[PDB]
Write an enzyme that holds these catalytic residues in place. Structure first.
Site, PDB file in Angstrom:
ATOM      1  N   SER D  98      -3.966 -16.049  65.271  1.00 61.03           N
ATOM      2  CA  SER D  98      -5.440 -15.398  65.504  1.00 61.03           C
ATOM      3  C   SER D  98      -5.654 -15.614  66.953  1.00 61.03           C
ATOM      4  O   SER D  98      -5.895 -14.546  67.514  1.00 61.03           O
ATOM      5  CB  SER D  98      -6.433 -16.426  64.779  1.00 61.03           C
ATOM      6  OG  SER D  98      -7.817 -15.884  65.314  1.00 61.03           O
ATOM      7  N   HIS D 215     -12.947 -13.761  61.036  1.00 59.76           N
ATOM      8  CA  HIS D 215     -12.213 -12.782  60.279  1.00 59.76           C
ATOM      9  C   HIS D 215     -13.030 -12.293  59.331  1.00 59.76           C
ATOM     10  O   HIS D 215     -12.430 -11.863  58.312  1.00 59.76           O
ATOM     11  CB  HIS D 215     -10.748 -13.111  59.840  1.00 59.76           C
ATOM     12  CG  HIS D 215     -10.079 -13.725  60.805  1.00 59.76           C
ATOM     13  ND1 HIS D 215      -9.663 -13.103  62.033  1.00 59.76           N
ATOM     14  CD2 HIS D 215      -9.348 -14.885  60.969  1.00 59.76           C
ATOM     15  CE1 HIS D 215      -8.749 -13.759  62.779  1.00 59.76           C
ATOM     16  NE2 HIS D 215      -8.587 -14.891  62.278  1.00 59.76           N
TER      17      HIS D 215
END
Ligand SMILES: Nc1ncnc2c1ncn2[C@@H]1O[C@H](COP(=O)(O)OP(=O)(O)OP(=O)(O)O)[C@@H](O)[C@H]1O
Ligand SMILES: Nc1nc2c(ncn2[C@@H]2O[C@H](COP(=O)(O)OP(=O)(O)O)[C@@H](O)[C@H]2O)c(=O)[nH]1
Ligand SMILES: [Mg+2]
Lengths: 68, 206, 352, 326
Positions: D98, D215
């Site tokens: 990420s 997300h």
């Protein structure tokens, strides 16, 4: 190079040094045998290792170290 | 098949041939003389004239086989036999004077008796006749029940609820349970004999 | 009981006891052998509720040698060699039990192969940054070395100040046990604590304080290869390990007042074929040179007398349950299938 | 050209891999002190002290974990370069989870260290603000074959609609490996999933220790800040094949990293697809070396679940201790 060279020279070798130190220490504590021992060692180190050779080595070491 | 129909299966029994000629009956003498004419197949890898040969344990090992790995299957079998033997010895040492007469330590006797305690005598045959499916009881042949005992034992020992317990230890525990008429395999035999008792009326559909 | 000998003192066994089993007491079992015995012999001890060892010619010869040993001459290296599962480890244990009963100091390494493979916790020695430590393998050995030699740990006293840390040090004249304790309490100093012990025992035995026995099983591991890696995925040589580097000094015959006994083992060896059993094949050139000169002793399969006695012992313990095993045909089949090999015979008798 | 087996793939960890003591074992290695000094220069506080000796509660805060992981990952890159020059020389693919993606690009020569730290700092601050804006969270769920994920998300949204809220959010946010996902959204929906796992056929459920829903669209407010931070930065062409998370393919042209990096902020992470794109091959073909450059070993377990054979040649760089004092 020693590895490339095809001989175990008993002279100025670890076997010679070890047996000399052992015999000096036994004399402090207190030949044909050395010839037999070096023959056995050179056979074992250069030719093939079999039980007969190991027994010859054993007998030579026993005679040199006064083991019966 | 690479064998001609002429070829007959071999008879490995070692004491059969040593039978004195006097004991042979005329039918048996005729059969022996006939066998000289017949072609005999090569004895397969497996059964031997060894005095320690046991066909039941050989069959169990063959049924545990996965992918032809006979070495591993026989390893598991011998480990199971050793584990059963050691557990019996451990329970024999700690037993009182009178309780040591009723402890069986032979793992072969335990294995045979445990498998015999799981054999069902009556089973079912799936039969759909009237557009709806019907179970009907039938008598199981001896081969079928011998097979079912081993199959139930192996399927129980292959269960996934046993996490990380190795097969020899699981199988030894199940064999020692079934030796004493306990465990899930005996319950599976009982739930078959009972659920075939609930369907005696359908027995006329044979 | 034709397979048992009433003489349970290893100092009085002879050639007439060859093939008979002698019993080791539970106290001797727990003191002499916390770690020595083979893993599959502990099972037999636990299941039979007794540890009985056969008297064989290899052990008898090696005992005759240790009885007539001159303690003024340098220590003589003995090497037990033979085919797999022939009983050399148990001959070494016989000799260790003999020496422990005569108040020798026992330095028993149950398996040197465990120090050259499958090690998680490797550290860099603060004493020397070029070598590596094995705290779990050293602290495991220290507890059992303490257990075997509890008596001497107070009589034997260090002869130098050892500095574990700026805060903690062992003063000259302290009993050896303290050092061992420092290795058992703080594993960080376990590997340093093993070497010091060796350094003392090899020294003080020369002075004549005690007789020392160096019993190393699988001695072929010291001059071979390791399966241990650095963080750069590069190989580590056996001499880089402090535990292995400090044990090679004990194999040299630069001391007297004891004997060095060892037994080869291909089981667990690294980079050796299954059928290699002779001294050079296992040791290597370096190993043979290091041990040279040494006395080799052969351990073979059971002769008929030993095989018959082992089967009689198993029958006397009711360990053969198959109804045909007691019969002569069963014995012939056992003999053929094992070929009189003790390990194969034991494994086959395990599931009969 | 190169046989598979002598090349290497570098995997950069992400959120949730922080650990107290991270950085010890890399400090003595070359160039690391300068990286941490530059991190101090750009951030305004001492990452070194916080990472080496921290309460773990300041280290679990969003504003602090991400830059720490970024710097530790790069320090592990220098450690690996010192130990194994050839592995860094023979590198074929790179991938970050990420925030580790920002690290991978920096390793690929698309961005510079200070640029990366500034971007990661702005990203972390904006994400923390967005998490503060509305309550939310994430849940790791391991399913069995009979498990339906979009189905469970639908009733997770139905419940919160019945309670009453504007557009309840609950959707799969991370695809990790077969039947293991991370769902993200409002805490009530995730509690519904936890309490109805049995109906939803979820073998395991574990609330991730995270501040908020990463997300998902809930992090929309943080998109505009990061874009600004990324506007000044001139991203070059990656030297190695660095994979994306939005669609799990190798970045083609540098003019699209600008928007894909901001899209990742509000899009699910296609980790399983990336692992497939890197390691899929026919039976028998060899696999490359794999190095997880950063704290933890989570990507190692994910790779084990995804591709066992590729996991056979996997190793992790130790960022907590060192064998040899260089
Ligand atoms: N002297 C003995 N007395 C009793 N049993 C013995 C003896 N020697 C060997 N055995 C039997 O052999 C088994 C294996 O012997 P041992 O562990 O000594 O083998 P080894 O020759 O050292 O072989 P390896 O290469 O496996 O180390 C022992 O468990 C025991 O069953
Ligand atoms: N912690 C500690 N260990 C020591 C000290 N001295 C010796 N040792 C350990 O005990 C062992 C003694 O073996 P030694 O003769 O010194 O071998 P060498 O110095 O490496 O060549 C060494 O391997 C050391 O690991 C000491 O003063 N402090
Ligand atoms: Mg052995």
């Amino acid at each position: 190079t020693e590895a490339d060279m095809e001989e175990y020279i008993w002279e100025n070798s670890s076997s010679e040094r070890n047996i000399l130190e052992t015999l000096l220490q036994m004399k402090a504590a207190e030949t044909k045998e050395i010839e037999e021992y070096k023959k056995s060692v050179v056979s074992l180190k250069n030719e093939e290792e079999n039980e007969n050779s190991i027994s010859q080595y054993k007998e030579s070491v026993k005679r040199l170290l006064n083991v019966t | 098949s690479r064998y001609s129909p002429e070829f007959k299966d071999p008879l490995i029994d070692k004491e059969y041939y040593r039978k004195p000629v006097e004991e042979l009956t005329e039918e048996e003498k005729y059969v022996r003389e006939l066998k000289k004419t017949q072609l005999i197949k090569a004895a397969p890898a497996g059964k031997t004239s060894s005095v320690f040969e046991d066909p039941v344990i050989s069959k169990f090992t063959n049924m545990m086989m996965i992918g032809g790995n006979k070495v591993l299957a026989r390893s598991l079998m011998i480990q199971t036999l050793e584990a059963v033997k050691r557990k019996q010895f451990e329970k024999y040492h700690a037993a009182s004077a009178e309780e040591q007469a009723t402890i069986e330590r032979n793992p072969y006797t335990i294995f045979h008796q445990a498998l015999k305690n799981c054999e069902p005598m009556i089973g079912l045959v799936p039969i759909l006749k009237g557009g709806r499916f019907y179970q009907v009881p039938v008598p199981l042949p001896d081969r079928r029940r011998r097979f079912l005992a081993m199959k139930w034992m192996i399927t129980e020992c292959r269960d996934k609820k046993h996490q990380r317990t190795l097969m020899p230890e699981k199988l030894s525990h199940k064999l020692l349970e079934a030796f004493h008429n306990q465990g899930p395999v005996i319950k599976r035999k009982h739930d078959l004999h009972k659920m075939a008792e609930a369907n005696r009326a359908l027995a006329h559909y044979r | 009981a034709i397979s048992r000998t009433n003489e349970n003192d290893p100092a009085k066994h002879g050639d007439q006891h060859e093939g008979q089993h002698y019993n080791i007491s539970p106290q001797d079992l727990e003191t002499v052998f916390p770690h020595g015995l083979p893993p599959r012999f502990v099972m037999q001890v636990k299941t039979f509720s007794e540890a009985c060892l056969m008297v064989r010619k290899p052990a008898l010869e090696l005992l005759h040698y240790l009885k007539n040993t001159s303690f003024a001459y340098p220590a003589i290296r003995y090497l037990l060699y033979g085919e797999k599962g022939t009983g050399k480890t148990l001959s070494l244990c016989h000799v260790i039990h003999f020496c422990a009963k005569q108040d020798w100091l026992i330095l028993h390494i149950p398996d040197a192969h465990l120090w050259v493979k499958n090690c998680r916790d490797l550290l860099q020695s603060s004493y020397n940054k070029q070598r590596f430590d094995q705290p779990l393998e050293a602290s495991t050995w220290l507890k059992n070395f303490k257990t075997t030699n509890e008596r001497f740990l107070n009589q034997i006293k260090v002869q130098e100040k050892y500095v574990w840390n700026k805060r903690e040090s062992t003063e000259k004249g302290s009993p050896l046990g303290e050092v061992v304790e420092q290795g058992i309490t703080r594993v960080r100093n376990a590997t340093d604590a093993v070497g010091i012990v060796l350094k003392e025992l090899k020294r003080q035995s020369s002075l004549g304080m005690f007789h020392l026995l160096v019993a190393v099983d699988g001695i072929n591991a010291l001059w071979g290869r390791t399966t241990l890696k650095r963080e750069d995925k590069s190989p580590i040589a056996p001499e880089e390990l402090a535990l292995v580097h400090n044990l090679r000094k004990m194999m040299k015959n630069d001391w007297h007042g004891g004997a060095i006994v060892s037994a080869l083992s291909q089981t667990g060896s690294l980079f050796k074929p299954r059928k290699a059993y002779l001294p050079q094949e296992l040791l290597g050139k370096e190993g043979f040179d290091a041990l040279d000169p040494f006395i080799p002793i052969l351990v073979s399969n059971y002769n008929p007398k030993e095989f018959e006695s082992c089967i009689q012992y198993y029958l006397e313990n009711n360990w053969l349950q198959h109804e045909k095993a007691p019969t002569e045909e069963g014995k012939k089949e056992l003999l053929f299938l094992s070929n009189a090999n003790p390990s194969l015979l034991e494994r086959h008798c395990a599931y009969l | 050209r190169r046989m598979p087996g002598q090349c290497s793939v570098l995997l950069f960890p992400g959120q949730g891999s922080q650990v107290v003591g991270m950085g010890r074992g890399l400090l003595n290695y070359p160039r690391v002190r300068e990286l941490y000094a530059a991190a101090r220069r750009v951030l305004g506080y001492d990452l070194l002290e916080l990472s080496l000796h921290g309460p773990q509660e300041t280290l679990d805060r969003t504003v602090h974990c991400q830059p720490a992981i970024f710097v530790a990952s790069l320090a592990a890159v220098e450690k690996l370069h010192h130990l194994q020059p050839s592995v860094i020389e023979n590198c074929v693919a790179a991938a970050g989870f990420s925030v580790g993606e920002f690290a991978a690009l920096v390793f690929a020569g698309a961005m510079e260290f200070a640029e990366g730290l500034y971007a990661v700092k702005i990203r972390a601050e904006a994400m923390q603000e967005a998490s503060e804006a509305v309550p939310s969270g994430m849940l790791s769920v391991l399913g069995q074959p009979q498990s339906k994920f979009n189905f469970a998300c639908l009733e997770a949204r139905e419940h919160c609609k019945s309670l009453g809220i504007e557009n309840p959010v609950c959707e799969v946010s991370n695809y990790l490996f077969p039947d293991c996902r991370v769902i993200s959204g409002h805490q009530e929906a995730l509690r519904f999933l936890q309490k109805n796992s049995s109906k939803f056929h979820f073998r395991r459920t574990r609330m991730l220790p995270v501040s908020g829903a990463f997300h998902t669209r809930l992090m929309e407010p943080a998109v505009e800040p990061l874009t600004q931070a990324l506007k000044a930065v001139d991203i070059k062409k990656p030297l190695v094949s660095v994979y994306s998370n939005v669609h799990a393919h190798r970045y083609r042209h540098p003019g699209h990293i600008h928007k894909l990096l901001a899209q990742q902020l509000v899009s699910p992470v296609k980790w399983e697809q990336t692992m497939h794109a890197i390691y899929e091959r026919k039976k028998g073909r060899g696999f490359p070396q794999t190095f997880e450059v950063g704290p933890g070993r989570q990507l190692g377990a994910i790779l084990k679940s995804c591709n066992m054979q590729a996991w056979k040649s996997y190793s992790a760089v130790d960022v907590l201790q060192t064998l040899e004092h260089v």
